[PDB]
């Protein structure tokens, strides 16, 4: 259908498909996202908060947005469990890891979905894009990083 040829037609690596059975479970899937009348991508996206065990669920990323701009508008209001009310979105990162590598990657919050999920080591699971949100300078952000390799994407 539609959807799943969207996703290949912009080079984006799905974790259930890198036989063809995983296209067809894919497929099946598809037939959350949602296309444009010009043919552009929204996505659900979840921003995971690992320091809190806590996350936010995005319902239309659009592929051409920025992350910033989201995060501008999520964290205009303090979060409940922002207990040290540090969440701000000039001081949040934004990571991704490379699960089979055991690395991570920085994503800059001026990117676009499309720029991030076009990493060649970006692999969407589920068909639902998920980051790792944290504040940089803070104890959690220094714990989680400990003895992993992270690197920024351009």
């Known amino acids: 259908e539609a959807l799943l040829q969207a996703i290949k037609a912009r080079n984006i690596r799905l ?23 010009q043919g552009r991508l929204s996505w659900p996206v979840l921003f995971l908060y690992p320091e809190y065990a806590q996350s936010d669920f995005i319902s239309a990323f659009h592929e051409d947005s920025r992350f910033i701009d989201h995060l501008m508008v999520m964290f205009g209001e303090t979060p409940s469990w922002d207990l040290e009310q540090k969440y701000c979105p000039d001081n949040l990162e934004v990571y991704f890891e490379d699960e089979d590598r055991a690395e991570l990657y920085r994503v800059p919050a001026k990117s676009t979905l499309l720029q991030v999920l076009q990493h060649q080591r970006y692999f969407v699971k589920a068909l639902t894009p998920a980051f790792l949100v944290c504040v940089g300078s803070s104890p959690f952000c220094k714990n989680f990083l400990r003895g992993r390799k992270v690197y920024q994407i351009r």
């Open 15 to 37: 974790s259930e498909a890198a036989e063809g059975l995983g296209e067809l479970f894919l497929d099946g899937l598809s037939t959350r996202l949602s296309l444009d009348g």
